[PDB]
């Protein structure tokens, strides 16, 4: 009954869509078709929107920024909504996992210098490994490819699953994820 904010990484510039990148967009985007949630308010180029997950309530938010979305979105509506931090999870692409993989984190680099600098560990986080850039190509360009035909079977399968993942997280908590999720325990 207490509510949750899910908010997911990217960006909403068309060229984003569906590249490496800005997978965390997807999964809230897949979350809120799942689950109902109707994500039609915009707060700059910040979309929204608030439904929710079986009995609990649940605001859907994909930032329109890499760099500030606490700030700039996350905190506000948090604090309005008086979400606590407890229940503000953060999704998005992680290239310290490999493609497609899934992993679920209680609070507590690159990725690793980047979460250090934004604070992110701070927040129930669902990472979605992308791998990292191969060989030397530029990162640049790397963030920006798109998943080729493999790496997108994969990925279909890690949004499949990180919907539920999530419908469980906010159900059962942590401790029904692990139950439910892990196969040692």
């Known amino acids: 009954y207490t ?3 899910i908010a997911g990484l990217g960006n909403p510039g068309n060229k984003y869509y ?6 965390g967009f997807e999964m809230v985007d897949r979350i809120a078709a799942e689950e109902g949630i109707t994500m039609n308010t915009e707060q700059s180029k910040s979309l929204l929107g608030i439904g929710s997950i079986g009995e609990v309530p649940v605001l859907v938010v994909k930032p329109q920024s890499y760099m500030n979305y606490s700030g700039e979105a996350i905190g506000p509506l948090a604090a309005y909504y008086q979400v606590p931090l407890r229940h503000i999870l953060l ?3 992680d290239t310290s996992l490999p493609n497609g993989v899934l992993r679920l984190q209680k609070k507590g680099g690159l990725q690793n210098v980047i979460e250090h600098l934004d604070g992110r560990r701070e927040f129930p986080r669902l990472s979605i490994g992308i791998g990292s850039p191969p060989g030397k190509m530029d990162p640049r360009a790397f963030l920006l490819q798109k998943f080729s035909s493999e790496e997108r079977v994969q990925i279909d399968t ?3 699953q990180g919907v539920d993942a999530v419908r469980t997280l906010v159900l059962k908590g942590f401790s029904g994820s692990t139950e ?4 040692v325990q």
């Open 158 to 160: 890690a949004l499949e």
């Open 180 to 183: 439910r999720f892990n196969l």
């Open 91 to 93: 999704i998005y692409d």
């Open 3 to 5: 509510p949750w904010l």
């Open 18 to 23: 569906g590249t490496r990148h800005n997978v």
